[PDB]
Design a protein around this ligand. Structure first.
Ligand SMILES: NC(=O)c1ccc[n+]([C@@H]2O[C@H](COP(=O)([O-])OP(=O)(O)OC[C@H]3O[C@@H](n4cnc5c(N)ncnc54)[C@H](O)[C@@H]3O)[C@@H](O)[C@H]2O)c1
Ligand SMILES: NC(=O)c1ccc[n+]([C@@H]2O[C@H](COP(=O)([O-])OP(=O)(O)OC[C@H]3O[C@@H](n4cnc5c(N)ncnc54)[C@H](O)[C@@H]3O)[C@@H](O)[C@H]2O)c1
Ligand SMILES: NC(=O)c1ccc[n+]([C@@H]2O[C@H](COP(=O)([O-])OP(=O)(O)OC[C@H]3O[C@@H](n4cnc5c(N)ncnc54)[C@H](O)[C@@H]3O)[C@@H](O)[C@H]2O)c1
Ligand SMILES: NC(=O)c1ccc[n+]([C@@H]2O[C@H](COP(=O)([O-])OP(=O)(O)OC[C@H]3O[C@@H](n4cnc5c(N)ncnc54)[C@H](O)[C@@H]3O)[C@@H](O)[C@H]2O)c1
Lengths: 330, 330, 330, 330
């Protein structure tokens, strides 16, 4: 079965670049605009820059490195011709069909599996790769959430802290690049904070990411919450976790546990560095979570860990990983 | 007749602030959001900061310094009850009804005059205060345009150059803050350059402002064109005019003519400074066009003149001026 | 005694604006540049905009609303003739004389008191207004630190939490506007993080501000630390405090304690809001610490509190308050 | 002769990356900081991102892919040990030795050639590659200037216009990313405009780049001037040239002449595109000047041409080209 993308946006386009680079063929791309515009946005990217290959188009297809990909502008997911293009797995990256009752419309068009690139409601399962991907059951799990970028940044760290030390409870903040949910200048929005000019403000906004970590690490249920602060950067984020552990530790012990995890069982998901880096250094990093070791603090059993993540590229790599897992399992 | 605003956006809200400060009663504000949100946006502004007064609201009204203003969320302009609010002049600042055939819908609800806060299609006349406001005729002109921010920046300077020296031809660029037409991150847009992340790019885009200037100053027909470059600032712009004149001049002579106009016949429209200023210094300046004298260059008959403008506040002051003209004329 | 300023920078100039508005006479301003430049920088400010008054200069003086202020460019503080200008209290805001042994150079020129506008080493006392200003002893305390902007944001909140609930320990992060210590583009710096382009990065950096809060609240000694994240905003910051308290609390109780303190004993120092604000809304706020009530979280005895602060204007208001206290006490 | 770099800054480091990729050996790098910092700044770049190879250091050397490069911190050019490292060609990229009298100090350290990466005074020749590099005479030209980034953007376009149509005179503006000469927040500067916060302003500033174009195209002497507007982008610029030609032309003819030159005699120096691009699309482009064809305008004999350039990477490629020319000539 082939792969399809609904919503060729920031996440959809990076997921495409990654799948394409891995040889996983996407057969249909659907959005709301014409193919000239889809091609143009793929070709030129303000963050990741020129597509490393050839991009062309006509009224029916995008042509990427000589490969024809059907490309359409069908607003209602029930009407997307997935079956005709041979698509069995749909990446749902529009942002408007995160309710499973709406995302299931892709099955009417002949899809077998939908991966929602966001927190969902009513999904069969939420997966964070490296943390609970072994819980995926291909016979029962058809509408699947890959969680949020922030949850993917948190869960690997929290898994390590729980397994090495035990976690009584924790709170976090993510200091996070702006995204297309926000506003360029002050403008009506359902969230009166996100209404405000994004590139000249620090903007507090509610996040379900810490609560949602309990979906993949049930030990955190009812004892993990947090906040987001959106700041004037275009991609790249950092999670600042303050945890109360079940024993007293040093910063060095916390770092050693995270390093061991990054080099071993969580390799490719969790990364670890002791370099004095900044945001631009993690742009286009494929990891979910990049521990910045020099920032770790400990006051007995109370610790502070920082983990960077490129909220576009890192997360998109996880969507691609999940697509490959779903394909592997049938 | 009372005044009404359709589109309580960046321009609509600043025009409201200005009219309120002048004692001009706005009796109805219409947008697409609830009154909590309208009140919030008025109260807290990322550029002009806290509204100088009390703002409150309920389901039917905004309350500003005690005074009740009907506040609604009616998507179709034909259905706004301007008549019941006593509104005769509508400020059309949504950005989606710049075609006079659509803006005329306000007359169905009982308005007598519509001021479109943008370049228009099919309007009765386009007015630039200080340049052709005497052409406004209340017996002929009912749907009128106040032109663009850029046209209002250019026309006062071009008037002076034409009258003092004569203009053979001219080209211009405006280096211009981003606006809400643009995108925060790369996203589909009808204009493939405006599709791109606004706060991390210089973005070329087409402008009709020079051609529009050549109509309010008709002697320049076919002799004036230009371009815009959108850059990462939140408000404030500068026009860079290169003109071939009908004789040799000096920079000093050009500056003297502009200063004379600013101090006399174009006072309140054209300003003049010799200070070494930058963008932040012209934020909330009420002028249409602010000549930066130290930037003026001349090579014989070829000159270069720079004029700043706050594309929100300055333009909003001109809308308010046009509103007061229209009210005065009946 | 009259007041002098050494270092007419971001803090020095705002302190001047504030003292001038309060009628406190500044008799000498010293920097490294000429009076034309000092006058220009006071007149035009990229954040606080046009100085509300007339500014002029000559080779020996700045003139503010017609009042002459001696203005010089003397690099060695031992050579500034404070006593000749009648100056007894020096505001030391250069950033390079925060070691008390260096700040004492002002005493050679006849000053009696030096207020270092930063954390210091070897000072007689560090004061945070509203927290320990009553500890000031005019007979013995001559070299005084007003602490950092961040310490001033933290100490009022920590005082309230200790007094209402008891604080076992705490960690914090400040998400903080860039400052002139940082680099516009990647450039050598003693801090490899601060070496990096400030306006296109989130930049972690060490802060002593939580540890230094123990200077004014000794109960926190060995029990409070944190981190800074510098982000692309030009002024305005927020402190994110995670505290372990001595009993279980609700977010409502934490907010009520902070509101009571803001409305009572800490009025003018600590503020409290329930509005959904963003950074631009706290620019030019005079408070040290502005609790954002809707962001408060509690999980049993672990709480999370956010306090905004304008790192320039708020802090400058505290410097001015301390200046007035020192003058009052003799 | 081997190559040396004095001033391992924005230009110095990119020139290093480019020479390294070309297999041109750099044998000494001098700056004002320690080798840890030089290695760190090479390794991690906020624009061009991770150095594509291994970087290490000790007290005496940097190591790039295992190759040892002497690395020192000698403030006085006369004292740099160029002779011991076998260096015959010094890239002078500190910004403080653009006067040939000071730059000549490298020759008494054993160097034979100095390429000043900026406009110079007293130099033996100023070269813009593609325009007058054939004038380089190795027997007489010791101290060589590679001109400014802006001059390199202008001269290729002006050469084409003169040769195809004839140029009577011209004026230009460059809309230009901020650079390390500028200030992060308002701070004293010799240039009162450049004193101002760079990332929240449009900042007009003088440029000698159009006048300096006459050094390589003498027909433009006294007939070409312009201005710069510094805007909040971290690299990437665009030149906006308004030229009066010696006959009437269309935009199509102008574009055809620029395309022919880009595809033929000026290949690798001048590029030509008809794509609808923005600043991020030209970051890390190696060309001096990239014509944006869709922006070209003509009114009779008055034309307007826009040419993009990465002021770091493009210019650094020209420094590398000139180094290779100087090496080839002996
Ligand atoms: N950007 C991030 O950092 C990030 C990270 C992880 C997850 N996500 C989630 O991924 C989803 C997409 O986010 P994004 O940032 O890529 O958004 P985006 O706004 O950049 O892209 C959304 C795309 O969906 C298209 N679209 C909207 N409605 C459609 C419809 N009915 N049919 C087809 N196409 C439609 C839009 O035209 C646009 O191209 C959201 O759920 C978001 O929460 C975003
Ligand atoms: N921002 C500037 O610099 C500037 C300057 C001069 C002119 N203008 C023009 O003014 C107009 C408004 O621009 P803006 O920047 O304020 O835009 P904006 O996007 O900030 O505001 C538009 C407002 O219109 C509302 N709206 C949209 N559709 C509506 C509808 N059908 N009914 C009622 N309300 C609706 C939106 O909710 C929003 O609040 C545009 O035509 C723009 O081109 C803008
Ligand atoms: N900016 C903030 O947010 C902030 C807040 C609280 C405290 N502070 C502290 O206040 C001090 C100043 O900070 P700033 O942001 O105003 O810095 P700044 O760089 O804006 O200003 C420093 C001023 O001192 C002048 N100066 C330097 N050396 C001098 C000397 N030898 N003699 C006279 N003048 C000299 C400089 O020319 C400049 O005008 C620092 O200690 C800083 O840590 C800053
Ligand atoms: N950045 C651009 O866009 C650009 C483009 C073309 C030319 N230039 C020119 O290249 C030169 C460097 O510009 P930049 O942007 O790389 O500047 P930069 O400030 O980034 O780098 C300058 C480097 O020189 C070092 N330095 C200063 N004095 C020194 C000394 N005495 N000895 C050794 N090293 C010293 C500094 O430590 C720094 O690392 C300037 O002349 C500039 O005008 C810059």
């Amino acid at each position: 079965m082939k792969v399809g993308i609904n919503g060729f946006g920031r996440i959809g386009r990076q997921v495409f670049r990654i799948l394409h680079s891995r040889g996983v063929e996407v057969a249909l791309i659907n959005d709301l605009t014409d193919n000239k515009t889809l091609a143009h946005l793929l070709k030129y990217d303000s963050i990741y820059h020129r597509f490393p290959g050839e991009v062309a188009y006509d009224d029916q297809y995008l042509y990427v490195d000589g490969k024809a990909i059907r490309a359409t502008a069908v607003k209602d997911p029930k009407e997307i011709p997935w079956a005709e293009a041979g698509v069995g797995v749909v990446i749902e990256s529009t942002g408007v069909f995160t309710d499973a009752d709406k995302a299931k419309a892709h099955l009417e068009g002949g899809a077998k599996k939908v991966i929602i690139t966001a927190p969902a409601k009513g999904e069969d399962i939420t997966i964070v790769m490296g943390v609970n991907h072994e819980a995926y059951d291909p016979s029962r799990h058809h509408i699947i959430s890959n969680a949020s970028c922030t949850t993917n940044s948190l869960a690997p760290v929290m898994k390590v802290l729980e397994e090495a030390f035990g976690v009584e409870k924790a709170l976090m903040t993510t200091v996070h690049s702006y995204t297309n949910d926000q506003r360029l200048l002050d403008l009506p929005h359902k969230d009166l904070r996100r209404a405000r000019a994004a590139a000249i403000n620090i903007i507090p906004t509610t996040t379900g990411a810490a609560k949602a970590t309990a979906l993949v690490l049930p030990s955190l249920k009812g004892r993990f919450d947090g906040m987001a602060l959106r700041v004037p950067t275009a991609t790249g984020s950092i999670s600042d976790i303050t945890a109360l552990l079940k024993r007293e530790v040093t910063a060095e012990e916390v770092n050693a546990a995270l390093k061991a995890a990054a080099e071993g069982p969580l390799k490719g998901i969790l990364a670890y560095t002791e370099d004095e880096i900044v945001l631009q250094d993690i742009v286009m990093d494929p990891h979910s979570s990049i521990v910045d070791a020099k920032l770790t603090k400990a006051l007995g059993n109370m610790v502070k860990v920082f983990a960077w993540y490129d909220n576009e590229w890192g997360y998109a790599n996880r969507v691609a990983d999940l697509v490959e897992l779903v394909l592997r399992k049938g």
